Paper text:
Als proteins are one of the most widely studied C. albicans virulence attributes; deletion of ALS3 produces the greatest reduction in adhesive function. An invariant Lys (Lys-59) at the end of the PBC recognizes the carboxyl group at the C terminus of a peptide ligand, allowing the remaining peptide backbone to associate in parallel orientation with β-strand G2.
Removal of the C-terminal AFR to form sNT-Als3 (amino acids 1–302) resulted in a folded protein that was monomeric in solution, with excellent dispersion of amide resonances. sNT-Als3shorter version of NT-Als3 that excludes the C-terminal AFR. When hepta-Thr was bound in the PBC, the Tyr-301 side chain was exposed to the solvent and did not contact Lys-59, possibly from electrostatic repulsion experienced by unpaired charges of the carboxyl group and side chain of Arg-302 at the C terminus. The observation that sNT-Als3 bound hepta-Thr was confirmed in solution by ITC.
Author numbering:
A (entry chain B): 1 to 7
B (entry chain A): 0 to 298
Write the structure that this text describes.
């Protein structure tokens, strides 16, 4: 799955 | 006792350990381990004296620990409490108390490691806009201070790998609030915007926008991490509810980009989906309507 990681 | 200064005396190393699978070594991508040299002398410090280490441009500590010890040659000589600046202030602090072990004949030299995330922006808050100017891609000097003694080190930071011309997003956890700030910047129309609609929403029922912590603005370009550097008023209308925040706007001048940000709450801040509205018409007539969804993860 394509996700974006938080910071 | 009293307030002392010059306990932290050197900035020995500043090294990145990728906390996830980040693609770039950015100041705001955790974790930066800052190793500082310190010294305490029982002839000039007593148990119960206090001292404070000021950390400009630091957003948070990337640990669940609330404090860290100053230890040398296996003995604890001070305890320091972490205070993250987050969205309250542009800097973080350590507030330290000398331990009873610092009996009068002790001369202690040691180091400590602090797990950090820098603030280089992320919303249109005063704090984030200020810190959006802290650093650039490449070599930077990072400076902390104890109250007189400035301690510095050079470090290399990588810019974001994301192409700044497209739409841009961000999600940063604010640990003391259990909220996440989230940002949306429209795709670039270099000659300005005739009009557009943008914003983001809860998708499945697990997300709530906090309408009391929002910003809507146009920024005069972006920094090396694709964050706003200014926030000016402009012609728009907005709707805001716990389900989402959306704007429709007109006549944004050349060189500016519209953006919206908000605090959000989620059932699980480590796994949530947002739905984005994304329509714009550049001055000159190029138009796109391209809504999308993003899956955000902290694991």
């Amino acid at each position: 799955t394509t996700t974006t990681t938080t910071t | 006792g009293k307030t002392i200064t010059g306990v932290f005396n050197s900035f020995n190393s500043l090294t990145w350990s990728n906390a996830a699978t980040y693609n770039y070594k950015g100041p705001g991508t955790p974790t930066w381990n800052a190793v500082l040299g310190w010294s305490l002398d029982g002839t000039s410090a007593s148990p119960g004296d206090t001292f404070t280490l000021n950390m400009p441009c630091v957003f948070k500590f990337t640990t669940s620990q609330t404090s860290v010890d100053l230890t040398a040659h296996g003995v604890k000589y001070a305890t320091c409490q972490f205070q993250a600046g987050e969205e309250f202030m542009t800097f973080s602090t350590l507030t330290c108390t000398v331990s009873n072990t610092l009996t009068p004949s002790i001369k202690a030299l040691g180091t400590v490691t602090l797990p950090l995330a820098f603030n280089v922006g992320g919303t249109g808050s005063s704090v984030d806009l200020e810190d959006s100017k802290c650093f650039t891609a490449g070599t930077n000097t990072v400076t902390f201070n104890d109250g007189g003694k400035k301690i510095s080190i050079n470090v290399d930071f990588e810019r974001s790998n994301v192409d700044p011309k497209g739409y841009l997003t961000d999600s940063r956890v604010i640990p003391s609030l259990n909220k996440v700030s989230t940002l949306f910047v429209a795709p670039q129309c270099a000659n300005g915007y005739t009009s557009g609609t943008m914003g983001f929403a809860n998708t499945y029922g697990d997300v709530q926008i906090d309408c009391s912590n929002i910003h809507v603005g146009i920024t005069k370009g972006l920094n090396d991490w694709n964050y706003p550097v200014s926030s000016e008023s402009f012609s728009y209308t907005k709707t805001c509810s716990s389900n989402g925040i959306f704007i429709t706007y007109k006549n944004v001048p050349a060189g500016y980009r519209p953006f919206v940000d908000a605090y959000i709450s989620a059932t699980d801040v480590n796994s949530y989906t947002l739905s984005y509205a994304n329509e714009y018409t550049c001055a000159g007539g190029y138009w796109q309507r391209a809504p999308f969804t993003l899956r955000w993860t902290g694991y």
